Structures are given as structure tokens and as C-alpha cells.
Symmetry: D5
Subunit: 91 residues, 10 copies
């Protein structure tokens, strides 16, 4: 699934890759479930879709914390920006 | 861009969509840049690639903070897990 | 996201479409998560990936039950094969 | 057809992959067949598509049972939710 | 799902489009199921896959018969080649 | 181009794969050529496209006869439905 | 298409139909020829090679249409086709 | 990037592959550039896009001549249809 | 061919979109042509491919100057980095 | 990520490939961000997207200069067209 061959990649690069694409897929799941939540005309499907939407938000948060713990620059930038107030582009 | 038609989606949903896919695109850029840094055999090229890799992390972090501010569940789950100690799943 | 234009589709069909593709995406995440579980050389990431692997299984299951309650043939074929013994083709 | 290389994947993980993508492809055919059932303006084609739609639902059902027999968590979660009454998220 | 817009296409063309992509999708499933039959190391799964493989051939054949009945050239060319002997060439 | 690796596939499975995808690609060209015939506003182009469309039906028909000859269930299922009368779903 | 139809000229849309018909024919020639090399069944190989060459013919016809209906295709095809010596 | 694996392909087949897909990629750029010429509302961009549109036409033609020189059936079929008069079919 | 619907885009934006993806496609032809130049074992074909590779570079160049003339930040950032000496990151 | 296999590619060709695709990916980021700048109905988000849009223009510029230093024909053609006035063609 990696774009470069595995023998030229440091083991750590490959685990960050596995974590990053797991976040990507959770995010995409959040977006698509929410869109189906707005568009659904069956209220029982909608509760299911919204529950799993929020489970996918959780999966993303866990895996982002791993990246933060395992990457110095994710650590610095996430601290710079998450849980702040005032203009985001100026933090 | 969207999966469902724009006319049945709430304004807020569509703005969050724009933020989510931007984080996705920055995440993917992080991954691909970093793999290229490992594999690059030109150190001037490697330096560019590694610099822009970290600019993409910042772009991701900015947009995720936006999601955090505009979505109750993004705020709750990011607060449960980010900047913690001990087993993440716990 | 539908193949045929929305105006020629019955509302129920579009609701089942939303359900089916949601199961498809959940299945896919189960598969991709589990493969990363085998391949991860970081045990912290592996635990995160396995936890979310199994939440994706739950989302699949909830949404198939919705399909079952809202489709006569899903109800029939699921009843025939799930929770059986002996050769599956022989049920 | 796998994301990770075959050599680091347990044999069962690869057979479960084969089952999951087969279920995925069956589901997609159900969906597309049903949409074409609604849209076809030739009632003969419509009968074919509806018949094969349901064969495809059956193929998904068979393979899902295989998953349930070969994965403790599929078995638990399918036991929690299928053939129940009342709110699915409860 | 069509390439040209629906307002400029004849209705029969659009039904034939529905039949054709149904055949393609069944064919693709035949191929992919059969490859998994070869590669599967769990024989209970292999049996499921081979049963579904062959149900997919049946869906293709039915829908190819619909095309044959609803398209003169499908009828001509399928008549020339199917169930013949000697070099297909 | 095979979903599974070549070393685990039987040679005849791989040749049927080569035949099957050739039929698919010919089928696709029938559909796309026929759609362009309906939509074209140049009658010379229209005549080219309808000519090649029907050539594509021929390549499919040829390769489907090969499949019939080389796969027991293609033979059985094709012999059940082609050149029949009355409701197909029987 | 790329752009929406309402901003496109009708000459451009017909050329598009011709161009992608050539592209698809070209792609079929390639994939057929690769399967000709790879096939270990000679009756299939004969079929695949036969249809390969029909696809070259479908491409050639449609290219003549582009030539007759596009001034620069007519110019560039005339410059290079059926020549000898360095193509550059 | 090839359909079949490289180890079972002739180098001739693979060089013709390189030529065919290069023509395909040029053909697409001609189409997409021309569509952008129609759609552009800036006359300078439009002028750039049209020039590069026509460079792509040239690249297809050169590479198509190589195919003619290296493939007996390319040679026969191109010589039947290019630069002719009357019904192409 | 736009991610967002045309009716919400500024006309100058869609034109810049048209120029950007044209650069992208020319860049891609340069890369793929060059790889075919290295790998090709026929020099007539390699010469053809090498000629068109460089024509594609020129197409990228022309189109990027249009972007430069119609977007201040393209103009600024391109003015900082192109035709410089010494470490590219430090300009 | 290459179309041809790495073993037949010169080391520098692969490096230029890495640089080219990096520019390509930046370019796409500029476009999609800018379209969302126009379309967003939340001004805080728009500010983020406009900032990141312009960071991506910068990455493209950096990486484009690297190409200019490592490819004689990029150097010639970039020399010809960038920072000029008058008809580009
Ligand atoms: Mg949870
Ligand atoms: Mg906790
Ligand atoms: Mg259903
Ligand atoms: Mg749950
Ligand atoms: Mg059955
Ligand atoms: Mg049956
Ligand atoms: Mg013929
Ligand atoms: Mg012919
Ligand atoms: Mg020229
Ligand atoms: Mg030039």
C-alpha cells in the first residue's frame, strides 16, 4: 500500500504510514456517515449511521494520539493548535 | 466533491466536509513526503521534501482544531485521547 | 453516489443503498485494519488498530440488521445461513 | 489484492480477506441491481435483474456465515444485533 | 452511470447499457471468484466461492440472452460462434 | 493483472481470466460506442462508431464461445438460456 | 467530459467522442497484444490476436475522421506519417 | 505499469506498449486542452492552451508513425484509411 | 471537473483551476516520458519520447508563467525560489 | 510509485520523479483549497484554507527550483517564460 518500496523505508516510517491511513479512513467515514445522516429518510438507519459516525471520530482521535506520541513534529504542531482560542492561523 | 446531493445537506455538514477532506489531503501528503525522504538519494531534494512534510502536519493540525471547535463529538474524543499517558485504548 | 439518477429511484431503494454501502465501507475497514494488525511492528498501534477493527465489525452488524428488517429477501437469506452447522452450501 | 504484503499476514487473515471482499462485491451488486430494477423500462430485463439481485443477497449471506464461524468478534457482534426487535443502537 | 447524457440517448440504448454492465459485473465476479477458489486455503470457503462463481455465470448467461433477443447484431454474432465446432479463428 | 498472485493460480484459470476480461472490455466498448452513436451529431463519425460497436460484439461473441468450450458451467449455463423462447428466468 | 457541456463547442464534443474512441482502441490493442504474448492456450491466442488487429483498424478509421475534421491533425499527420529517416 | 507481468512479455511488446500509452496520453491532453480553450474566460490562457493542444497533436502523430514502422498491421490499416476520400467505412 | 460546484466559484478561480491542472498533466507527462526514455531499448522510440518530454516541460513553463502573472502569491513565492543559489529551504 | 521498474531507472530519473510528483501534489492542493476558499460559508475555516493554499504554492516553488537546478531543459524553458511580459506564445 506504500508508494515507495518497503526495503528503502525505515520501519518507523511504515508504522506511521499505517497510522496515518487509518486516520484518513476514519475521517472519510466521519464525512460520509454524516452526509448520509443529513440525507436519510429512515430515522432508524439515521441513528445507526450517526452512532457509527461518532465511533469513527473516536478511532481517529486514538490513532492521532499515537502519531503525536511517535512523531516530534506532530507533537509540536498538535500542541500549538489543539485546544486553543483566538485565530487558528496565528497560534 | 460530496457523496450525497448538496440540496439535502445542511450548511454545517458541507463546511465540515471541506475541513475533513482537507485534513485527509494533508495527512496523505505527510505520508507520501516522509516515504520520499527515506527514499530520496539527493540531500537537497530530501531537505525540501522533509520541510514541506512538516508544513503539511501543521496544515492538518490547524484544520483539526477547527473541527474541534465546530463539532461536539470531535471536541469530546480529541479531549479524551490527546496529550495523555498510558495505554491509549484505556 | 447512486448509479441511476435519484428521480427514478424509490426512496426505500435509496435508503437501502445508503445502508449497503455503509456495510461495504465497514467491511473494508475490518479487512484493512486486520491486515495492519498482522503487519504492525508497534504493539501500541496494533492495540488501537484491533480495537477499531472490531468497532467496524459492530457497525457492519447493526446496519445488516437494518437491511434485514427492511428487505424481505435479506431476511430470508440471512435466516437460512446465519447461525447454522455443517456445510454452508448444504443449508 | 491485499494492502499489506502476503508474507507478514497470517493465513487466516488472508482467507478472511477473501471472504470480506467477496461479501463486499456481493453487496455492491445487490445495490446496483436494485437501482436498475427501479429504472429499467423493459420488464423482461427487470425480471432478470431482480432475480440475480437476490442470488447476490444469498451469496453475501453464505459468506457472512463463514465469517461468523471463523472470527470470534463477527460471531459476537452478529449475535448481538441480528434477528432482534426494537431499537438497533440499544 | 452512462457516459453520454440521458436526454440524448435512446431508451433502448439505456436498457442495453443496463444489461451490458450487469453482464460485465457478473463476468468480473466469475473471474475473481474463480481465482479465490484456486488461492483459498480454507476448503469450506472454497466451496462457497465456487458455488457463487457458478451462480455468477448463470446471471451472465441470462442477461446475454436478453441482449441477444433485443439487439439484431448480438443475435447475428452470437449465432455465428456459440455452440460451433472448428477454429474460432 | 490478476487479483490473486500467479504462482497460486492454475494456468487454465489464468487463461480464462484473460478471456473473461477481454469479453468485459469488449462489452464496455459496445456500450460506450452505442451511447456515442446516439449522441453524435456528425453522421460520418456516427457510421464509424456503429461499425466498431458491432465489431466489439463479435470479439465478445468469439471469446464467449471459447469460454463455453473451456468451462463446464459456462457450457451448461449458456446452453440453458441462449437461443431459447419464453421467459428467461427459467 | 472535463468541462460541463454548456460551455463547450459542439465541434469539440464530437472530436472528444472520436478521441476517446481512439484511446480506448489503442488501449485494447495494447492489452490484447500483451495477452497474446502471455497466453498459453493457442485457440485463445488466435482470438486475441484477431481482435487486436480489428482494434487497430477501428483506431485507424477514427483517426482518418479526426484528420478530415481538424486542421492541425491533418497538418501533423501529413508531416510524419508514411515517411523515412529520423522521425525527429 | 503493464497489464501482464514483465517477465512473460517480449521487449517488442513492451516498447509498443510505451508507444501506445504515450499516444493515449497525448490524445487525452489534446481533448482536455481543447475543452479548456472553449471554457476559458482569459484570452491569454486560452492562447497558451491552444498552442499546447496542438503540440500534443504533433506528439501523437510522431509516435503514431513509429507504430506504423514497427507493426505490420498498423502499417496496413493506417495505409487503408489515412488521407483518403469518400465514406471511411 | 471541479471539486466544488461551479455556481459557487469565482470565474478567476476556475480559470486558475484550468491552468493548474494543465501544469499537473504536463508535469506527469514529463515524468512518465522520462521513465520511458530510461527504459526503452529502441533509440528511434527513445528520441521521440525525449523530444516530447521536453515539449511538455515547455508547456508546463508557459502555463506556470500565466499563473505567475494572475496570482500574487504564485508571483511572490516563485520570485523567492526560482533562479537562486544556495540552500533552497533557506531562501 | 514509478511506472517503469526501479531497476531500469537511473537514480536521478527517480529523484526527478519524486520531485515532479511532489510539485503535482502541491498544485492539486492549491486548487482544491482555493475552490473551498470560494465555497466555504465559515470564515474561520476559509482563513485556514487560504493559509494552507499559499503554503502549498510555496512548496511547489521550492521543488520547482530543485528541478530547475537538476534538469537542463527545465532550466532553459523556465528561463524563457518566467518573469516575462508580453504574449506568452
Ligand atoms: Mg468507541
Ligand atoms: Mg480513556
Ligand atoms: Mg437490499
Ligand atoms: Mg459501538
Ligand atoms: Mg440460489
Ligand atoms: Mg441459480
Ligand atoms: Mg470481424
Ligand atoms: Mg474490420
Ligand atoms: Mg513542436
Ligand atoms: Mg515547444
Amino acid at each position: 500500500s506504500t508508494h515507495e518500496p518497503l526495503e528503502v523505508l525505515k520501519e518507523e516510517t511504515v508504522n506511521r504510514h499505517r497510522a496515518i491511513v487509518s486516520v484518513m479512513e476514519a475521517l472519510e467515514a466521519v464525512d460520509w456517515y454524516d452526509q448520509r445522516v443529513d440525507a436519510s429518510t429512515d430515522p432508524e438507519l439515521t441513528a445507526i449511521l450517526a452512532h457509527n459516525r461518532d465511533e469513527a471520530k473516536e478511532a481517529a482521535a486514538m490513532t492521532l494520539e499515537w502519531l503525536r506520541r511517535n512523531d516530534a513534529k506532530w507533537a509540536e504542531h498538535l500542541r500549538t493548535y489543539l485546544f486553543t482560542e483566538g485565530p487558528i492561523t496565528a497560534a
